[model samples]
Target: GSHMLREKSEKFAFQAEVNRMMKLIINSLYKNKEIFLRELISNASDALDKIRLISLTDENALAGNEELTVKIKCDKEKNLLHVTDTGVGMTREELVKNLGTITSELIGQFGVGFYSAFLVADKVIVTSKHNNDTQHIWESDSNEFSVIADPRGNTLGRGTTITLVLKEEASDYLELDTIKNLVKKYSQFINFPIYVWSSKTVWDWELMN
Candidate 1:
């Protein structure tokens, strides 16, 4: 169950392999940068799945929002995209343990999935809230990252938001149509409703008449 904790800030660096991995990607890893969106969406779904399973025994385990959904938003002017989910979010210690470790044993599940974000963005910023703690921010560039108490406080209530500042070539990700295609292609079958903000027109017949 979620519990409240005092506010505190911390900093950490990426694991040693992070540098090598970035180099590999920069030199010769991914041919399709757009796949990064799919990878992030996949990770969010996994998080939602875990929380739902935990709630089987302890109904209160869903300290986060009761609505289990994933949302995506893009800002073309800023060249950024945000992926957020109402699921199990990490505590500060958990962030250090989960993100700072190099062991395959810990990260084998979504290790590569996380790194994929760099394929499309110059900076990756994560703001997350857990049932037990205040929100925190994790920002990374290349081989290093820092974690600190979020000035915005508990905006998420629970869950995580991963923001990607897109590279020049990856600007297409900020397009609503591109995101629509990606979500349909990669996550249409996901149990949770995945919403992407679009300029969808809703016609009011009365107004038209």
Candidate 2:
């Protein structure tokens, strides 16, 4: 893994209308940043579907993996929310290819909005384990990205955990109530169970004097 951010430099390239499109996205046209979690879960579901499809022929394809599901956990103290799942994860090469270009379908092209998780998050920490490779951590903030072998290790078995450190204005995401509403609204229909680790108070029956 190369260094994340170059100390002092401003250099880039953009093609026609790309800047305009980014401006709109980074600006305000997309009203709800909570959709960030929805998009991530959808992507996870797609990965699960792909791997599950392969199991049709291999029979033992999943090895010991369990049924696919997405889970969400929020840490109000860290202002971070995590969306995780049991699904296929990206390798380093795949990460570069997917993140570096606007992916083209047989019918059209699609910008990588998954990367746009950065739009609402001050930082994103991607923890993943590929069946064929070691677990790793990929992190990004504003100007740069980083990928390092996960020292804490691969408890994931397979799939990825995406952690978003919400920006100040996006702090509402750390509220369990808000996130619970968002999930129920957007992902309740997903094929797998979606769990939210919510915040609740266990109030004392007696009050202090």
Candidate 3:
């Protein structure tokens, strides 16, 4: 006599300024599309820094995921690129506030780097889990975005996974060689270890820096 319970997601409109900012970043600000990878890696590093800092005061901070590393994988069949960071993740409220609105405070914390994903992607999906909050999915097509409880549960343990559905012209970013070169050129000095999922016969994670 029980009925199925459906999980509902909330849809939100981007602030007008956010829309304009995205267009500016995609079109003018960053002429080289490869810069998008650099921006994402930098943001991931910042997230790792936050988690490490908090773990200093509270040992339980790393209970969910102890490893602090950034991992990247590309699915050529689906034309998707995923950047996963084992860092302090965002709660549902933080997802809406940080991604939906563009303010100086948000910029100082996250930078306009997040929006650079639009430079090479038509759609972006972010699945994140924080130590204090449940897992949530934030998805957008650059026009608007939605947030919903992740039915897959806390697969992340504690961190964020950003998946980019690449545009046709941007598929070059999916190449292992291309990703390796970019990381070496732009993020060689980032403190945390960055890994890229690579394939020879079997797939394995290769440390970039």
In angstroms, the error of model 2 at 47 is: 1.1
Ordered by TM-score, highest first, the candidates read: 3, 1, 2
lDDT of each residue in 1-209, candidate 2, tens digit only: 33444532222233335445445555552564555666776777787887788778867657646667777888888788898878877665454444433411211124244655766888878888767777877776645556667788767878888999888988888876787778877676677667776544742112101
> Across residues 50-87, which tens digit of lDDT does each residue of candidate 3 receive?
99999999979999988999999989999999999999
Candidate number achieving the greatest lDDT relative to the actual structure? 3
TM-score of every prediction relative to native: 0.83, 0.77, 0.91
Model 1 TM-score?
A: 0.83
Model 1 ranges with Cα > 4 A deviation: 1-9, 25-28, 103-111, 201-209
Per-residue error (Å), model 1, residue 177: 0.7
Off by over 4 Å in 2: 1-24, 28-30, 103-111, 199-209
If both were scored by TM-score, which would come out higher, candidate 2 or candidate 3?
Answer: 3
Which candidate has the highest TM-score of all? 3
Q: Rank the models by lDDT, top first.
A: 3, 1, 2
